[PDB]
Swiss-Prot record, chain A:
Residues 1-200 form the NR LBD domain. 9-cis-retinoate binds at residue 64. All-trans-retinoate binds at residue 64. Receptor for retinoic acid that acts as a transcription factor. Forms homo- or heterodimers with retinoic acid receptors (RARs) and binds to target response elements in response to their ligands, all-trans or 9-cis retinoic acid, to regulate gene expression in various biological processes. The RAR/RXR heterodimers bind to the retinoic acid response elements (RARE) composed of tandem 5'-AGGTCA-3' sites known as DR1-DR5 to regulate transcription. The high affinity ligand for retinoid X receptors (RXRs) is 9-cis retinoic acid. Belongs to the nuclear hormone receptor family. NR2 subfamily. This is Retinoic acid receptor RXR-alpha. Induction: Down-regulated by aging. Induced by pulsatile shear stress.
Length: 200, 195, 193, 203
């Protein structure tokens, strides 16, 4: 189904942990509204969210950032701020490889939902009790996305593959965001500097 | 053994360039861009090749020299994790769906034609050639495996795995730790016992 | 469990600022430079503290929560943990590194003139010279029988640097304590309405 | 004395050619190590471990020091300007070599005896994994840095802090060390254009 994925998509310094907690929770609420996700073992649900949270978050804010130049919306962080916090390279990749590609092809929210659902339903995730079941749910999602794309954009016969071929970029940007601690430098950066200037 | 590795590398790079030149329209790109695509691509292209070659082998990979490497050796050289990912995420997935050599070729051609490669003079042209390749692959899949309507997507969805395994092979120096470990010890000793 | 870690971090950062301000001449640096030194230094400063605390423990580190190397190897960070033990904790034990000597090393680490963005690196270098001049005085007087003790102290800093970067790169702290707390978090979220 | 350390210090197919350059460089490094007192008296297993543990920092220390006689470049005989380094995608690491090592060595006029002794300290690293007798390596490192302090106190008595200043370049050497591994710094520098030149065998 493609209607419940779009429906899902539409619906003290270190205590940066609170902001993180709230962000992760938004992500869990979304996952629970993806058909069949909540019918997986609880251990498997946790593994998929642990495996997925980084790429899922980047996909969200990348897409939000379509409405913005040389920035991402969380609110608004300009690329000059990102370069200043020593994560310029990774930020520019988000812009060129994700945000602009999403803009150029006017990726809609149903299509974002389905990609995120493919990422979430990752049968490669380590420790999954039944990877075959996860694979099966991902097949349902991308079968459903192809149906949606063929109907809404029949003039764009390549559109389905183009969507799927943004996932490799998402994966590498994924790993670079972990490795550079991208999320926690973005929200945590100045709050820390501001805290520390309690040496005044 | 060290001289073998360096020759094998040279031969592999050469094989890789000859292959790329025989991909339609590749040689019609700017020369700067051809170099960028091969330099951006050689890691994933090589892993795709040997992963697929390794379909015909249990708990191992075959390298295009002939050199079979079992996972026992890989875990012994302290790259067990990365080796197991190659096996589970690539080799077995390729086996399970019986990925044929046409389908490997088209994926390698998609990887080669990477319009995200840094410094490309005309990314739009590279993107255009990748569209031709994956349009051609979908045609092939729909006709040879009409019973498997999801086969095209399944092929494309091995590329993220290839990307991460790609970066992990760089980051761990996967190739050099596999074959190069004791050859280096042997090298250094030869140098140490020389005058 | 997660809430506790985040509080402990906040408390650690605070302890760290109070400490730095009580280092002579630190507070006489530009505010921009003070922030840079603490941001550049917090990782090595913390590892130096808990490494030294862990002298009183076998095959473990003390952070109140004792962490045994069996748990560390089980959480896939055995390599980094063993480096902390062999290169820092045991070396500190073997030479009976005292708390004055730890303080001076931490002060040398803090006064890092290599820190990027420093307005006046020459001033930071000058304060580090004062610190390590002071440490040599201390070493030569308390351990005159150990004429190489000063150099030995300074030659633990490279280890501190590499273990520093390896702890960042592996997310050493988060994988140690944060593993199951995260699983527990996500379940809390999953069984919420 | 520390004369033997200074004496030590004052001595188509694109991948194959990089490998030859590497081979030659590593060999110069072994010849140097053999002329360090007591090194050749270690077990052969231990000698191999120290060179395996050490080669990256030892090489960087050499070329950093050689590069004192050069602006916004490093000397390997092939001078490499920072423009080329930034072009080969290793600009960050190159700038660190310049700021943290080359300029610091220039500013304090580090001489070749002092470089030798630091390299000898790096070589005699008792933290190296698998050493048969790390106590012996530690003992040789103590001899080296005891000898360096003697040299510094005599040649630069006006600079009482010069010994510590020398030793406190080693952390920088370590981090630049790990960054050079992680980026494959050496092989991108020497291997860079040879590859580009090879590949431009498209016609
Ligand atoms: C020991 C060692 C050193 C290095 C490297 C790797 C190792 C290295 C050596 C062994 C030997 C081994 C052996 O003695 O059989 C082993 O099992 O695992 C190793 C793992 C390693 O990472 C790389 C490839 C990262 C290049 C940089 C240097 C420092 C030369």
């Amino acid at each position: 189904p493609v209607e419940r994925i779009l429906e899902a998509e539409l619906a003290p310094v270190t205590n940066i942990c609170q902001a993180a907690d709230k962000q992760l929770f938004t992500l869990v609420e979304w996952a629970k509204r993806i058909p069949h996700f909540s019918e997986l073992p609880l251990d498997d649900q946790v593994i998929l969210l642990r495996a997925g949270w980084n790429e899922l978050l980047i996909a969200s804010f990348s897409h939000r950032s379509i409405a913005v130049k040389d920035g991402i919306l969380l609110l608004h962080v300009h690329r000059n701020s990102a370069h200043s916090a020593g994560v310029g390279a990774i930020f520019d990749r988000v812009l060129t490889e994700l945000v602009s590609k999403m803009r150029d092809m006017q990726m809609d929210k149903t299509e974002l939902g389905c990609l995120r659902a493919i990422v979430l339903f990752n049968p490669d995730s380590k420790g999954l009790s039944n990877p075959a079941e996860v694979e099966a749910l991902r097949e349902k999602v991308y079968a459903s996305l192809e149906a949606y794309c063929k109907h809404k954009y029949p003039e764009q016969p390549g559109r389905f593959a183009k969507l799927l071929l943004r996932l490799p970029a998402l994966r590498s940007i994924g790993l670079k965001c972990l490795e550079h601690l991208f999320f926690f430098k973005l929200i945590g950066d100045t709050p820390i500097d501001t805290f520390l200037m309690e040496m005044l």
